[PDB]
């Protein structure tokens, strides 16, 4: 397993920061992002879990 592409990350951060008010995408948006980034929905789901926590522990 290798890390995500510089672009996939950009795509995810865009979504994340674009929704700082509730970074909890629906299974649809997740499926959406998943295909956009060319990664599984699990991978997106993990990415958001890790993103939220690591955002918080650094406020």
């Amino acid at each position: 397993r290798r890390n995500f592409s510089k672009q996939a990350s950009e795509i995810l951060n865009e979504y994340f920061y674009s929704h700082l008010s509730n970074p909890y995408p629906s299974e649809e948006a997740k499926e959406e992002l998943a295909r956009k980034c060319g990664i599984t929905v699990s991978q997106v789901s993990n990415w958001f879990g890790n993103k939220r926590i690591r955002y918080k522990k650094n406020i």
């Binding site: 700082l20 509730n22 970074p23 909890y24 699990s42 939220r52 955002y55 918080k56 650094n58 406020i59």
Partner: protein, 75 residues
């Protein structure tokens, strides 16, 4: 993440820490017990919590999580 324009609820601290990793033996059995019977009876519940030195809640949670993991591997 140094500066959030505001502190939204989700950024708050939920959960009114520790993650007791489980020994290889414990996990090997719970797993062993899982291939045998996907759900648990109050009976099996106690005898196991007993054998592997764990609370009942832990055996209950262990199987709940194992079921979701089973669901997602589809297999």
């Amino acid at each position: 993440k140094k500066n959030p324009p505001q502190i939204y609820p989700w950024m708050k601290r939920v959960h009114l820490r520790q993650r007791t990793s489980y020994t290889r033996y414990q996990t090997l059995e719970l797993e062993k017990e899982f291939h045998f019977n996907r759900y648990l009876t109050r009976r099996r519940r106690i005898e196991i919590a007993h054998a592997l030195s764990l609370t009942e809640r832990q055996i209950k949670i262990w199987f709940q999580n194992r079921r979701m993991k089973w669901k997602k591997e589809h297999k």
